[PDB]
Hints:
homodimer; alpha+beta; three-stranded antiparallel β-sheet; 23% helix; flat; cysteine-type endopeptidase inhibitor activity (chain A); Cysteine proteinase inhibitor (chain A); protease inhibitor (chain A); thiol protease inhibitor (chain A); hydrolase inhibitor
Amino acid sequence: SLEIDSLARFAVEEHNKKQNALLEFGRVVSAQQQVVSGTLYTITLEAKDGGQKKVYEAKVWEKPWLNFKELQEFKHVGD
Amino acid sequence: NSLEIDSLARFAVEEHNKKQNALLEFGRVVSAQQQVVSGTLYTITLEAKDGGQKKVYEAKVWEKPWLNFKELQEFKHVGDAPA
């Protein structure tokens, strides 16, 4: 499929540009697609780690009608 | 919504601790934003060459064609391929 091949090449190029890398696209080996629905929560929370209180940002994709939850991002943003 | 957001914050910390083998001790929710999401999510396995070597990668790309929007949400080295 031309569409998937184009998305795959986008991913590599975008990875390259973001990380300053030189990956050379080879080929798509398999691909799935799904309709996105539900809600994306961006949550700032405090938790203790390394002996001190730290602030993290989490992005959680959830679909209530399935009890589906996926952590899509989790980063330390402050203390 | 407050219980819901608390339950998702706890899930986030649990999942982080599991993935990273970490020991975060949940404190509290500080703030939260939310947005309904739509469009299409593609999960792609691909091969690419890195220095001399061919490697296998998993990419996720979120697309919203009515906005010409594409976002790389994951790009992970998942396997090695023969020399």
